[PDB]
């Protein structure tokens, strides 16, 4: 856990000042004033919707979720109100494949990528047993959500440095594109559909496209192909005074 590129090649995360005012004897939090709250909501819209170019006819329906937010500063309940709206479902549930919706939730509300097939299976079982709202409630009330973002910050794609598995890093970069990249390029057809169920990894170029500035992205590519061969059994020796031993 060092984040060699979290807070130096990337800006700091955005959100509420601090959670101590939540203890609330005379107020719930220092009135951030209306001009440092409209940028907070602008930031949330850019995250939970992920640059969906929402018109104001479609922002005339999120008035009620917003109006409670500036009154009672929990961010997590704001996104819980947003992800259950028709604005969220009509964009991400309506035209899409299933694991596409599931994987987009990891990008939007958790800021990381699905680490395995079993996580996707657990989400699938949890959806089948009565609704999609259960999926969002499991994610939002999760432990992982508490020990990553909490009730203060916008959920952002954090470079952890100390990932539980490496494919989690790859699949974080593939869902997160560049700026001016949205989530209706493919008509469904999730990007990690094949790679999750198979276990292989993703394209090197599309991961490198999403890296921040000044990170020597893309280089170091040998001109022969990139995916390794599981079936390879190479011999590599060590060096001994008498000879070379293939300690394999």
């Amino acid at each position: 856990a060092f984040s060699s590129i979290q807070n130096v090649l990337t800006d700091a995360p955005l959100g509420t000042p601090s959670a101590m005012g939540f203890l609330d004897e005379r107020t719930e939090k220092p009135l951030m004033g209306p001009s440092e709250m409209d940028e907070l909501v602008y930031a949330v819209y850019k995250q939970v919707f992920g640059n969906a170019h929402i018109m104001e006819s479609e922002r005339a329906e999120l008035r009620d979720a917003e109006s409670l937010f500036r009154y009672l500063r929990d961010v997590r309940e704001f996104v819980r109100a947003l992800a259950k709206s028709n604005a969220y479902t009509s964009r991400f549930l309506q035209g899409n494949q299933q694991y596409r919706f599931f994987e987009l939730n990891f990008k939007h509300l958790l800021g990381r990528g699905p680490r395995s097939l079993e996580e996707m299976a657990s989400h699938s079982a949890l959806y089948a047993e009565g609704g999609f709202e259960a999926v969002i409630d499991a994610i939002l009330d999760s432990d992982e959500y508490a020990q990553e973002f909490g009730s203060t910050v916008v959920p952002y794609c954090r470079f952890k440095g100390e990932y539980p598995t490496n494919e989690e890093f790859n699949r974080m970069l593939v869902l997160k594109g560049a700026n001016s990249t949205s989530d209706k390029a493919g008509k469904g057809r999730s990007k990690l559909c094949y790679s999750i169920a198979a276990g292989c990894s993703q394209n090197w170029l599309s991961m490198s496209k999403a890296l921040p500035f000044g990170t020597e992205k893309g280089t170091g590519f040998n001109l022969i192909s990139s995916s390794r061969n599981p079936a390879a059994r190479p011999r590599i020796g060590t060096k001994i005074p008498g000879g070379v031993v293939f300690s394999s």
């Binding site: 060699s4 440095g161 890093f169 790859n170 276990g199 292989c200 990894s201 893309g218 170091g220 300690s247």
Partner: protein, 177 residues
């Protein structure tokens, strides 16, 4: 994930075969050296920090271009991350040595690592060198062959465990190649 006992179980499940007495020499012998494996794993994890700091310094020793401006290991940030990468590899090979199976390495480590390094521009050859330095001093510690760092053990041969951990480091080396 799997271990040595869960290896044979899934192998026999592919045949729908019970685990009979013929297949239990491998496991009962696995239990014979059980104290040997425990005597080896704390010897390795007991020197964990020194092994990594020696490994990256050895990497740098014969590749001074990594320090140079534009080097992948140029600034303190990148040394810090590269320092982090050594512990992640060493911890996972220790897990695999403890479980007696590398079913935890390439699903929760190598699986999707080569592409991560390719996207980040991490040089493969120098990382392979770092892994091999770590490999050689892994065997040095298992066999009590380190120049200093005299550890008290029980007399016998741990050579098979040495070859096991060498094979585990091998697949880390070949996974990112």
């Amino acid at each position: 994930m799997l271990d040595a006992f869960s290896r044979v179980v899934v192998n026999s499940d592919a045949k729908a075969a019970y685990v009979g007495g013929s297949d239990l020499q491998a496991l009962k012998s696995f239990i014979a050296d059980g104290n040997k494996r425990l005597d080896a794993v704390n010897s390795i994890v007991s020197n964990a920090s020194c092994m990594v700091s020696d490994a990256v310094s050895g990497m740098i020793c014969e590749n001074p271009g990594l320090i140079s401006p534009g080097g992948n290991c140029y600034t303190n940030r990148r040394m810090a991350a590269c320092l982090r990468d050594g512990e992640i590899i060493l911890r996972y090979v220790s897990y695999a040595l403890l479980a007696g199976d590398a079913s935890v390495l390439e699903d929760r480590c190598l699986n999707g690592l080569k592409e991560t390094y390719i996207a980040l521009g991490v040089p493969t050859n120098s990382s392979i060198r770092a892994v091999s330095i770590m490999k050689a001093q892994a065997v040095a510690f298992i066999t009590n062959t380190a120049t200093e760092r005299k550890m008290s053990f029980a007399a016998g041969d741990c050579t098979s465990l040495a070859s096991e951990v060498a094979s585990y480091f091998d697949r880390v080396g070949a996974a990112i190649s």
